[PDB]
Amino acid sequence: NQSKILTLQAYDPAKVLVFIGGQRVSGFAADTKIVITRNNDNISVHAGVDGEISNALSRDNTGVMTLSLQNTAKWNGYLAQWQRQANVTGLIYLPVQVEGSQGLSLNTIGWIQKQPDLSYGTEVGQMDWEIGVLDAWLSPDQIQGIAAGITGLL
Template sequence: MAKGIEVASYDPKKVNVIVGGRTITGFAADGVVSVTKNEDSITPAVGAKGDVTYSENANESGTIAITLMSTSSSLSYLRELEAKRRAINVTISDVNDADAFTLSADNCRVMKMPDLTRNKEQSTITVNIYAPSVVPR
Protein backbone atom coordinates (compact mmCIF):
# COMPACT_ATOMS: atom_id res chain seq x y z
CA MET A 1 0.00 0.00 0.00
CA ALA A 2 1.35 3.41 -0.94
CA LYS A 3 2.15 5.77 1.90
CA GLY A 4 0.27 9.04 2.13
CA ILE A 5 -2.82 7.86 0.25
CA GLU A 6 -6.06 8.50 2.06
CA VAL A 7 -8.71 5.83 1.66
CA ALA A 8 -12.25 6.41 2.86
CA SER A 9 -15.56 4.69 2.37
CA TYR A 10 -19.00 6.21 2.12
CA ASP A 11 -22.28 4.45 2.81
CA PRO A 12 -25.49 6.35 1.93
CA LYS A 13 -27.35 4.07 4.35
CA LYS A 14 -25.56 5.94 7.15
CA VAL A 15 -27.26 9.22 6.17
CA ASN A 16 -30.70 9.79 7.71
CA VAL A 17 -33.12 12.65 7.15
CA ILE A 18 -35.94 13.17 9.65
CA VAL A 19 -38.62 15.77 8.90
CA GLY A 20 -41.22 16.59 11.53
CA GLY A 21 -40.36 13.41 13.42
CA ARG A 22 -40.73 11.13 10.38
CA THR A 23 -37.81 9.38 8.68
CA ILE A 24 -37.79 10.22 4.98
CA THR A 25 -37.45 7.28 2.56
CA GLY A 26 -37.37 6.72 -1.19
CA PHE A 27 -34.29 8.75 -2.08
CA ALA A 28 -33.31 9.09 -5.73
CA ALA A 29 -30.24 7.35 -7.14
CA ASP A 30 -28.41 10.63 -7.72
CA GLY A 31 -28.60 12.03 -4.21
CA VAL A 32 -30.00 12.03 -0.71
CA VAL A 33 -29.81 15.55 0.66
CA SER A 34 -27.87 18.76 0.17
CA VAL A 35 -27.62 21.72 2.51
CA THR A 36 -26.86 25.16 1.08
CA LYS A 37 -26.32 28.30 3.14
CA ASN A 38 -28.22 31.27 1.68
CA GLU A 39 -25.49 33.88 2.17
CA ASP A 40 -21.75 34.09 2.76
CA SER A 41 -20.59 34.15 6.39
CA ILE A 42 -18.50 37.27 5.86
CA THR A 43 -18.31 40.25 3.52
CA PRO A 44 -14.73 41.44 2.95
CA ALA A 45 -13.92 45.07 2.22
CA VAL A 46 -10.50 46.19 0.99
CA GLY A 47 -9.31 49.76 1.55
CA ALA A 48 -7.27 51.93 -0.83
CA LYS A 49 -3.99 50.71 0.73
CA GLY A 50 -4.97 47.06 0.87
CA ASP A 51 -6.27 46.98 4.45
CA VAL A 52 -8.96 44.34 4.85
CA THR A 53 -12.05 44.41 7.05
CA TYR A 54 -14.45 41.51 7.44
CA SER A 55 -18.09 42.22 8.19
CA GLU A 56 -19.68 39.25 9.92
CA ASN A 57 -23.03 38.12 8.54
CA ALA A 58 -25.50 36.85 11.16
CA ASN A 59 -27.70 35.18 8.53
CA GLU A 60 -27.36 31.42 9.11
CA SER A 61 -30.40 30.49 7.00
CA GLY A 62 -30.28 28.00 4.20
CA THR A 63 -32.06 25.50 2.04
CA ILE A 64 -32.23 21.77 2.65
CA ALA A 65 -32.85 19.99 -0.67
CA ILE A 66 -34.13 16.42 -0.39
CA THR A 67 -33.86 14.38 -3.59
CA LEU A 68 -36.57 11.72 -3.89
CA MET A 69 -37.86 9.25 -6.44
CA SER A 70 -41.31 10.16 -7.77
CA THR A 71 -42.51 6.89 -6.20
CA SER A 72 -41.34 7.83 -2.68
CA SER A 73 -44.03 7.38 -0.03
CA SER A 74 -42.54 10.42 1.75
CA LEU A 75 -43.78 12.78 -0.99
CA SER A 76 -47.40 12.73 0.20
CA TYR A 77 -46.22 13.54 3.75
CA LEU A 78 -44.10 16.46 2.52
CA ARG A 79 -46.99 17.75 0.36
CA GLU A 80 -49.23 17.60 3.42
CA LEU A 81 -46.71 19.62 5.47
CA GLU A 82 -46.60 22.28 2.75
CA ALA A 83 -50.38 22.41 2.41
CA LYS A 84 -50.83 22.84 6.18
CA ARG A 85 -47.99 25.40 6.24
CA ARG A 86 -46.57 23.78 9.35
CA ALA A 87 -43.26 24.68 10.95
CA ILE A 88 -41.23 21.52 11.40
CA ASN A 89 -37.94 20.26 12.79
CA VAL A 90 -35.44 18.77 10.32
CA THR A 91 -32.58 16.56 11.45
CA ILE A 92 -29.86 15.25 9.15
CA SER A 93 -27.48 12.70 10.57
CA ASP A 94 -24.43 11.38 8.70
CA VAL A 95 -22.43 8.82 10.70
CA ASN A 96 -19.92 7.96 7.97
CA ASP A 97 -16.33 7.99 9.20
CA ALA A 98 -15.24 10.81 6.90
CA ASP A 99 -16.90 14.20 7.49
CA ALA A 100 -19.67 12.95 9.81
CA PHE A 101 -22.10 15.59 11.06
CA THR A 102 -25.50 16.18 12.58
CA LEU A 103 -27.70 19.13 11.68
CA SER A 104 -30.87 19.88 13.60
CA ALA A 105 -32.95 22.86 12.52
CA ASP A 106 -36.16 24.11 14.12
CA ASN A 107 -38.98 26.19 12.61
CA CYS A 108 -38.34 24.98 9.06
CA ARG A 109 -40.90 25.15 6.27
CA VAL A 110 -41.41 23.29 3.00
CA MET A 111 -40.89 26.10 0.48
CA LYS A 112 -43.38 24.98 -2.17
CA MET A 113 -45.53 22.03 -3.10
CA PRO A 114 -43.31 19.23 -4.50
CA ASP A 115 -43.85 18.65 -8.22
CA LEU A 116 -46.44 16.15 -9.38
CA THR A 117 -44.98 14.23 -12.31
CA ARG A 118 -46.08 11.09 -14.07
CA ASN A 119 -43.71 9.76 -16.72
CA LYS A 120 -42.96 6.52 -18.51
CA GLU A 121 -40.46 5.75 -15.75
CA GLN A 122 -40.02 7.09 -12.26
CA SER A 123 -38.32 10.48 -12.08
CA THR A 124 -36.50 12.59 -9.50
CA ILE A 125 -38.26 15.20 -7.41
CA THR A 126 -36.44 17.71 -5.22
CA VAL A 127 -38.18 19.07 -2.14
CA ASN A 128 -36.72 22.32 -0.80
CA ILE A 129 -37.07 23.16 2.87
CA TYR A 130 -36.16 26.58 4.27
CA ALA A 131 -34.20 26.44 7.52
CA PRO A 132 -33.52 29.50 9.73
CA SER A 133 -30.11 28.01 10.58
CA VAL A 134 -28.09 25.39 8.70
CA VAL A 135 -25.02 25.60 10.90
CA PRO A 136 -24.25 22.12 12.33
CA ARG A 137 -23.91 22.25 16.10
Protein backbone atom coordinates (compact mmCIF):
# COMPACT_ATOMS: atom_id res chain seq x y z
CA ASN A 1 0.00 0.00 0.00
CA GLN A 2 1.23 3.48 -0.94
CA SER A 3 0.71 6.76 0.89
CA LYS A 4 -2.08 8.93 -0.54
CA ILE A 5 -2.34 12.71 -0.66
CA LEU A 6 -5.48 13.69 1.23
CA THR A 7 -6.12 16.70 -1.04
CA LEU A 8 -5.13 18.15 -4.40
CA GLN A 9 -4.86 21.80 -3.34
CA ALA A 10 -3.02 23.09 -0.26
CA TYR A 11 -4.74 24.47 2.83
CA ASP A 12 -4.15 28.23 2.57
CA PRO A 13 -5.11 30.23 5.69
CA ALA A 14 -5.53 33.41 3.62
CA LYS A 15 -8.39 31.74 1.72
CA VAL A 16 -10.52 31.53 4.88
CA LEU A 17 -12.98 34.43 4.60
CA VAL A 18 -14.92 35.86 7.55
CA PHE A 19 -17.85 38.17 6.75
CA ILE A 20 -19.38 39.99 9.72
CA GLY A 21 -22.28 42.13 8.55
CA GLY A 22 -21.16 42.06 4.91
CA GLN A 23 -17.52 43.18 5.28
CA ARG A 24 -14.36 41.08 5.27
CA VAL A 25 -12.37 40.99 8.51
CA SER A 26 -8.64 41.70 8.33
CA GLY A 27 -5.73 41.97 10.73
CA PHE A 28 -5.76 38.57 12.43
CA ALA A 29 -3.50 37.22 15.17
CA ALA A 30 -0.47 34.96 14.71
CA ASP A 31 -1.39 31.37 15.56
CA THR A 32 -5.17 30.86 15.40
CA LYS A 33 -7.74 32.94 13.53
CA ILE A 34 -11.09 31.54 14.72
CA VAL A 35 -12.32 28.74 16.98
CA ILE A 36 -15.88 27.39 16.97
CA THR A 37 -17.23 25.28 19.84
CA ARG A 38 -20.65 23.93 20.79
CA ASN A 39 -21.99 24.76 24.23
CA ASN A 40 -23.71 21.43 24.95
CA ASP A 41 -23.51 17.79 23.91
CA ASN A 42 -25.55 16.70 20.90
CA ILE A 43 -27.18 13.63 22.49
CA SER A 44 -27.72 12.69 26.13
CA VAL A 45 -27.81 9.11 27.42
CA HIS A 46 -29.93 7.69 30.25
CA ALA A 47 -28.75 4.31 31.56
CA GLY A 48 -31.03 2.21 33.74
CA VAL A 49 -30.06 -0.19 36.49
CA ASP A 50 -31.06 -3.22 34.40
CA GLY A 51 -29.03 -1.88 31.45
CA GLU A 52 -31.76 -0.36 29.29
CA ILE A 53 -30.47 2.63 27.31
CA SER A 54 -32.53 5.57 26.06
CA ASN A 55 -31.34 8.82 24.49
CA ALA A 56 -32.82 12.27 23.91
CA LEU A 57 -31.72 14.87 21.37
CA SER A 58 -30.49 18.32 22.40
CA ARG A 59 -32.05 21.40 20.80
CA ASP A 60 -29.56 23.93 22.25
CA ASN A 61 -27.41 24.94 19.28
CA THR A 62 -25.90 28.10 20.77
CA GLY A 63 -22.13 28.35 20.44
CA VAL A 64 -19.16 30.67 20.87
CA MET A 65 -16.86 31.83 18.06
CA THR A 66 -13.51 33.11 19.30
CA LEU A 67 -11.91 35.79 17.11
CA SER A 68 -8.30 36.92 17.54
CA LEU A 69 -7.20 40.33 16.27
CA GLN A 70 -4.09 42.43 16.78
CA ASN A 71 -4.68 45.45 19.00
CA THR A 72 -3.41 47.63 16.14
CA ALA A 73 -6.07 46.32 13.74
CA LYS A 74 -8.71 48.83 12.68
CA TRP A 75 -11.55 46.34 13.24
CA ASN A 76 -11.19 46.85 16.99
CA GLY A 77 -12.76 50.28 16.58
CA TYR A 78 -15.66 48.99 14.48
CA LEU A 79 -16.65 46.35 17.04
CA ALA A 80 -16.17 48.75 19.96
CA GLN A 81 -18.44 51.36 18.37
CA TRP A 82 -21.02 48.76 17.36
CA GLN A 83 -21.11 47.54 20.96
CA ARG A 84 -22.29 50.92 22.25
CA GLN A 85 -24.56 51.46 19.24
CA ALA A 86 -26.36 48.19 19.98
CA ASN A 87 -26.43 48.97 23.71
CA VAL A 88 -28.19 52.28 23.04
CA THR A 89 -30.51 51.35 20.16
CA GLY A 90 -31.18 47.79 21.37
CA LEU A 91 -30.34 45.86 18.18
CA ILE A 92 -27.55 43.33 18.74
CA TYR A 93 -27.98 40.72 15.99
CA LEU A 94 -26.01 40.73 12.74
CA PRO A 95 -25.21 38.07 10.13
CA VAL A 96 -22.04 35.99 10.43
CA GLN A 97 -20.45 33.89 7.68
CA VAL A 98 -17.29 31.78 7.46
CA GLU A 99 -15.85 30.17 4.33
CA GLY A 100 -13.49 27.23 4.73
CA SER A 101 -10.52 26.65 2.46
CA GLN A 102 -10.41 22.84 2.64
CA GLY A 103 -12.86 22.23 5.48
CA LEU A 104 -16.34 22.94 6.81
CA SER A 105 -18.10 26.31 6.71
CA LEU A 106 -20.65 28.27 8.75
CA ASN A 107 -23.44 30.75 8.01
CA THR A 108 -25.74 31.90 10.83
CA ILE A 109 -26.64 34.92 12.97
CA GLY A 110 -24.40 36.09 15.79
CA TRP A 111 -23.70 38.79 18.35
CA ILE A 112 -20.86 40.12 20.49
CA GLN A 113 -20.83 38.32 23.85
CA LYS A 114 -17.71 39.59 25.65
CA GLN A 115 -15.05 42.19 24.90
CA PRO A 116 -11.50 40.84 25.30
CA ASP A 117 -9.06 42.29 27.80
CA LEU A 118 -6.51 44.86 26.63
CA SER A 119 -2.85 44.66 27.66
CA TYR A 120 0.04 46.92 26.65
CA GLY A 121 3.56 45.51 26.73
CA THR A 122 6.90 45.29 24.95
CA GLU A 123 5.39 43.49 21.95
CA VAL A 124 2.17 44.07 20.04
CA GLY A 125 -0.81 42.86 22.04
CA GLN A 126 -3.63 40.54 21.04
CA MET A 127 -7.40 40.67 21.55
CA ASP A 128 -9.65 37.59 21.44
CA TRP A 129 -13.21 38.74 20.76
CA GLU A 130 -16.03 36.29 21.49
CA ILE A 131 -18.92 36.23 19.01
CA GLY A 132 -22.04 34.23 19.73
CA VAL A 133 -23.81 32.16 17.09
CA LEU A 134 -27.48 31.21 17.01
CA ASP A 135 -26.64 27.80 15.50
CA ALA A 136 -23.18 26.21 15.60
CA TRP A 137 -23.72 23.50 12.97
CA LEU A 138 -20.71 23.36 10.66
CA SER A 139 -22.01 22.67 7.16
CA PRO A 140 -20.02 21.08 4.31
CA ASP A 141 -19.33 22.61 0.91
CA GLN A 142 -18.00 19.54 -0.91
CA ILE A 143 -19.13 16.61 -3.07
CA GLN A 144 -20.54 15.10 0.13
CA GLY A 145 -24.16 14.05 -0.21
CA ILE A 146 -24.00 10.98 -2.44
CA ALA A 147 -22.62 8.81 0.40
CA ALA A 148 -24.83 9.97 3.28
CA GLY A 149 -27.48 7.67 1.82
CA ILE A 150 -25.05 4.75 2.06
CA THR A 151 -23.74 4.79 5.64
CA GLY A 152 -27.34 4.45 6.81
CA LEU A 153 -28.08 1.13 8.52
CA LEU A 154 -30.29 -0.29 11.25
